Amino acid sequence: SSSVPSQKTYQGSYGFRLGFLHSGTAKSVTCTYSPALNKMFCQLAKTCPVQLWVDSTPPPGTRVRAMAIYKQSQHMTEVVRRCPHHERCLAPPQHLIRVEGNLRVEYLDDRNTFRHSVVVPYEPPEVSDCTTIHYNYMCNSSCMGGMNRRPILTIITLEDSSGNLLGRNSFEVRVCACPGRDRRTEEENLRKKG
Amino acid sequence: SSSVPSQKTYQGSYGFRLGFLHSGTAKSVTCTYSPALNKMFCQLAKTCPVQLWVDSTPPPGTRVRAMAIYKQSQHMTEVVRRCPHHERCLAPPQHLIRVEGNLRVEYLDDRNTFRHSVVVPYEPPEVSDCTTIHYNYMCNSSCMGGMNRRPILTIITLEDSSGNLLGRNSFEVRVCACPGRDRRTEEENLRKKG
DNA sequence: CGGGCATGCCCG
DNA sequence: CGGGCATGCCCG
Ligand SMILES: *C[C@H]1C(=O)C2CCN1CC2
Ligand SMILES: *C[C@H]1C(=O)C2CCN1CC2
Ligand SMILES: *C[C@H]1C(=O)C2CCN1CC2
Ligand SMILES: *C[C@H]1C(=O)C2CCN1CC2
Ligand SMILES: C[C@H]1C(=O)C2CCN1CC2
Ligand SMILES: C[C@H]1C(=O)C2CCN1CC2
Ligand SMILES: [Zn+2]
Ligand SMILES: [Zn+2]
């Protein structure tokens, strides 16, 4: 009955985890992940790679879904969408999250919650310990009429073809002009005032 | 043959001038006019009163047209429009400038230049030295996908019913959250660095 | 209200 | 590139 998808971490029986590349905090890095904050800082319309780690191999037909929700309680019931400017300038223009480099991407609009998601087949790592998906976020967190400075969580779910939830993980995202600057500011604020 | 409307001041044979109320520079004033900069600072979707002064009375049927153009050479050929966010949230939604409080307003989209303008009948001052029109600017200068931080000029023309230009004046506009702050900053910069 | 944090971006 | 100006707005 809830229209708000769950965000609670569920590593599940396959030992599903996410992982992220190390990139550092130079002012101009295109993306950078903060383990302390469990938060990706990235630039709009640029690659944001996410690694899928599993302990046990999921069954054939498993899918990987990504969906954004607002992190703050007061905004969690509002659907996360592209702002009108970037909508106008495969993926429907209203979708915030895209996957690049995949021939089997599917973009979904839920008929009951109206929430957007993007799904690709799960592929096991090559003869490697993880699989990488290249996500793109098509608005800045600050975009007026879209995210409007509100932080989001991206929820990644591993689902079998029957729709069973096999695993769930999430991470906070800030899409911004200067990921390295902003990661440094938020980590310093965590240390001084968190 | 030009698609860029003239901005050159033409006081003309009726002695046409604009005038503005004095309001000062408190951080929260809703609008404030800088004589030194010939520039109105105002807030979006709030009243921006403009006075029409004439020495001689225009003929019956005279009209008052307002149009925005970009002030900087590199942007002057681009039509000034409402941004997509405020377009979606009598006046066509794409028009930046509205007139409030007038039963005879007309909104025009030029069939050749595609430029927008808003026109009201000229009314002589009451048995007073000027007539006031209440304009509204429906985007901030900073709106993404609209003015995008580019300064505009508003061009006010006094036209007879046959279309003769009787007079023309213009003023720069900044639509912003804090007119009083921003007028003070720009006047100080004029003094220190202009 | 006024102080000052925010965050895209600097081109007259 | 990194410094710092910009400019809406501060609500976990
Ligand atoms: C943002 C992205 C990059 O450009 C490399 C470093 C960090 N992340 C993975 C690869
Ligand atoms: C973050 C900062 C940089 O280092 C370049 C990209 C965006 N911003 C301006 C230049
Ligand atoms: C912006 C507007 C106001 O609110 C009064 C002072 C200045 N201007 C005219 C009236
Ligand atoms: C300019 C400043 C003010 O004084 C109020 C209006 C907008 N901004 C925040 C509050
Ligand atoms: C998990 C991830 C790594 O750490 C490298 C790059 C691709 N996968 C295998 C080797
Ligand atoms: C010109 C203008 C003024 O200065 C006041 C207000 C209205 N008009 C007449 C009196
Ligand atoms: Zn956007
Ligand atoms: Zn706007």
What this model shows, in words?
- It is classed as transcription.
- The entry lists the keywords P53, tumor suppressor, DNA binding protein, protein DNA complex, michael acceptor, michael reaction, protein-drug complex, protein-DNA-drug complex, loop-sheet-helix motif, DNA target, activator, transcription, hoogsteen base-pairing.
- The assembly is tetrameric.
- In chain A, strands 2-3-11-10-5-8-7 form a 7-stranded mixed sheet.
- In chain A, a hairpin with a 6-residue loop joins strand 7 and strand 8 (116-121).
- Chain A has helices at 84-88, 179-193; strands at 17-19, 31-34, 39-42, 47-53, 63-70, 97-100, 106-109, 116-121, 131-137, 152-159, 165-175.
- The first copy, chain A, is globular.
- Chain A has one domain (1-194).
- With 194 residues, chain A is mainly β.
- Chain A contains 2 helices and 11 strands; from the N terminus they run βββββαββββββα.
- Chain A binds chain B through residues 83-85, 87-89, 143-145, and chain B through 83-85, 87-89, 143-145.
- Bound molecules: (2~{S})-2-methyl-1-azabicyclo[2.2.2]octan-3-one (QNN) (6 copies) and zinc ion (ZN) (2 copies).
Beta content of chain A: 25-35%
Bound molecules: (2~{S})-2-methyl-1-azabicyclo[2.2.2]octan-3-one, zinc ion
Structural class of chain A: mainly beta
Helix segment tally of chain A: 2
* Oligomeric state of the chains in view: homodimer
Overall geometry of chain A comes to globular
Summarize the biggest pleated sheet of chain A: 7 strands, mixed
How are the strands of the largest sheet of chain A arranged?
Answer: 2-3-11-10-5-8-7
Please give the radius of gyration of chain A in angstroms.
16 Å
In percent, how helical is the residue content of chain A? Answer: 10-25%
User: What is the element string of chain A, with H for helices and E for strands?
Assistant: EEEEEHEEEEEEH
Number of domains of chain A: 1
The total beta strand count of chain A reads 11
Distance between the termini of chain A: 35 Å
Question: Which two protein chains have the largest interface (Cβ within 8 Å of the partner's Cβ), and how many residues from each?
Answer: A-B, 9 and 9 residues
Region (Interaction with AXIN1) (chains A, B): 23-193
Region (Required for interaction with ZNF385A) (chains A, B): 7-194
Binding site for Zn(2+) (chains A, B): 83, 86, 139, 143
Region (Interaction with the 53BP2 SH3 domain) (chains A, B): 142-149
